[PDB]
Amino acid sequence: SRTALRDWLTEQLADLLGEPLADVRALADDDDLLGCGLDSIRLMYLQERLRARGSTLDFAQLAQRPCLGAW
Numbered sequence: 001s002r003t004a005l006r007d008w009l010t011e012q013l014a015d016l017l018g019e020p021l022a023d024v025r026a027l028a029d030d031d032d033l034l035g036c037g038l039d040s041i042r043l044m045y046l047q048e049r050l051r052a053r054g055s056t057l058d059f060a061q062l063a064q065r066p067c068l069g070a071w
Contacts, residue, residue, distance in 0.1 A: 016045055031067055033067060043063055
Protein backbone atom coordinates (compact mmCIF):
# COMPACT_ATOMS: atom_id res chain seq x y z
CA SER A 1 0.00 0.00 0.00
CA ARG A 2 1.48 3.41 -1.06
CA THR A 3 -0.11 5.29 1.92
CA ALA A 4 1.42 2.92 4.53
CA LEU A 5 4.78 3.42 2.77
CA ARG A 6 4.12 7.23 3.04
CA ASP A 7 3.40 6.71 6.77
CA TRP A 8 6.84 5.04 7.17
CA LEU A 9 8.53 7.98 5.34
CA THR A 10 6.36 10.28 7.55
CA GLU A 11 7.71 8.54 10.67
CA GLN A 12 11.28 8.78 9.32
CA LEU A 13 11.02 12.49 8.38
CA ALA A 14 9.28 13.37 11.67
CA ASP A 15 12.14 11.62 13.53
CA LEU A 16 14.98 13.01 11.32
CA LEU A 17 13.75 16.64 10.97
CA GLY A 18 12.67 16.82 14.67
CA GLU A 19 8.98 17.41 13.69
CA PRO A 20 5.57 15.92 14.61
CA LEU A 21 4.28 13.30 12.09
CA ALA A 22 1.31 15.67 11.68
CA ASP A 23 3.68 18.38 10.32
CA VAL A 24 5.05 15.82 7.78
CA ARG A 25 1.45 14.77 6.91
CA ALA A 26 1.00 18.54 6.29
CA LEU A 27 3.18 18.13 3.13
CA ALA A 28 1.75 17.31 -0.28
CA ASP A 29 3.53 14.24 -1.79
CA ASP A 30 5.33 16.46 -4.37
CA ASP A 31 6.51 19.00 -1.71
CA ASP A 32 10.26 19.68 -1.62
CA LEU A 33 11.88 18.41 1.59
CA LEU A 34 14.95 20.63 1.11
CA GLY A 35 12.19 23.25 0.75
CA CYS A 36 11.05 21.98 4.22
CA GLY A 37 14.28 21.83 6.28
CA LEU A 38 15.82 18.47 5.18
CA ASP A 39 19.54 18.18 4.24
CA SER A 40 22.18 15.50 3.52
CA ILE A 41 23.15 14.87 7.19
CA ARG A 42 19.52 13.72 7.57
CA LEU A 43 19.10 12.17 4.06
CA MET A 44 22.07 9.80 4.67
CA TYR A 45 20.39 8.54 7.85
CA LEU A 46 17.18 8.08 5.81
CA GLN A 47 19.12 6.16 3.14
CA GLU A 48 20.44 3.82 5.89
CA ARG A 49 16.94 3.36 7.43
CA LEU A 50 15.60 2.58 3.92
CA ARG A 51 18.41 0.03 3.35
CA ALA A 52 17.69 -1.45 6.85
CA ARG A 53 13.97 -1.69 5.79
CA GLY A 54 15.35 -3.68 2.78
CA SER A 55 14.45 -0.67 0.53
CA THR A 56 18.01 -0.30 -0.89
CA LEU A 57 18.54 3.05 -2.70
CA ASP A 58 21.66 5.25 -3.10
CA PHE A 59 21.58 8.85 -1.79
CA ALA A 60 21.09 10.52 -5.24
CA GLN A 61 18.28 8.09 -6.18
CA LEU A 62 16.32 9.87 -3.43
CA ALA A 63 17.98 13.29 -3.52
CA GLN A 64 17.62 13.92 -7.33
CA ARG A 65 13.80 14.45 -6.87
CA PRO A 66 13.57 15.55 -3.21
CA CYS A 67 9.84 14.93 -2.58
CA LEU A 68 7.79 12.04 -1.20
CA GLY A 69 6.12 11.50 -4.63
CA ALA A 70 9.39 10.49 -6.33
CA TRP A 71 10.59 8.48 -3.30
